[PDB]
Design a protein around this ligand. Structure first.
Ligand SMILES: [Ca+2]
Length: 223
């Protein structure tokens, strides 16, 4: 997360770390047994880490659970990053508490100019390499589709939105792929891509979760 702040420990209780010997992506807890992340975060042998703040120290609140199953969206295109969404089933149910909570699925899509919260652990620098150990946060509006498609001509589909600032400086890219974008108490986004990091007229590009709620509910209930 470039150009934000330290959330505070356990202030984003739905935030998940996907670990494969190291932290490689974020995710969101949508119920005791399921996580949603990005399809470009697909690996084998994932461990899901809940209740984290500092990913390098065991601060007491953690829950470490092996993933039993991963489901990538049937229409995921890894070239265009269209339908960049994946579902991860926990081997054992998470124990929900003050620090470990679910986030709700949208009943409807969010509109432009709606403020959202984007959280994650990744690269804080637009130029160079600096990985934070603690959860970071950014508040950013959803930009209008016009403003989005203009920044990435012929790259943006219906299943994407942009958030942040047209001037750059503040963005998420490498700053946690797969991470949540929460607007008015609902999961509206997943950190998908963005050209460079926090560049001028290069916003972040998010998977538009409200398009997928039917897929998510049908998949989860059948698996
Ligand atoms: Ca920790």
């Amino acid at each position: 997360i470039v150009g934000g702040y330290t959330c505070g420990a356990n202030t984003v209780p739905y935030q998940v770390s996907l670990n494969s010997g190291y932290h490689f992506c974020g995710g969101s807890l949508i119920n005791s047994q399921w996580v949603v992340s990005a399809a470009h975060c697909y690996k084998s042998g994932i461990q899901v880490r809940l209740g984290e703040d500092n990913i390098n120290v065991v601060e007491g609140n953690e829950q470490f659970i092996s993933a039993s199953k991963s489901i990538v969206h049937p229409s995921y295109n890894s070239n265009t990053l269209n339908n960049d969404i994946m579902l991860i089933k926990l081997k054992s149910a998470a124990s929900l508490n003050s620090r470990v909570a679910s986030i709700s699925l949208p009943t409807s899509c969010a509109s432009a100019g709606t403020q959202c919260l984007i959280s994650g652990w990744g690269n804080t620098k637009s130029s160079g390499t600096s990985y934070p150990d603690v959860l970071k946060c950014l508040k950013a509006p959803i930009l209008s589709d016009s403003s989005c498609k203009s920044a990435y001509p012929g790259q943006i589909t219906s299943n994407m939105f942009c958030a942040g600032y047209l001037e750059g400086g503040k963005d998420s890219c490498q700053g946690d792929s797969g991470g949540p974008v929460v607007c008015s108490g609902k999961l509206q986004g997943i950190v998908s891509w963005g050209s460079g990091c926090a560049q001028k007229n290069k916003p972040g590009v998010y998977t538009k979760v409200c398009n997928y709620v039917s897929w998510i509910k049908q998949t989860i209930a059948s698996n």
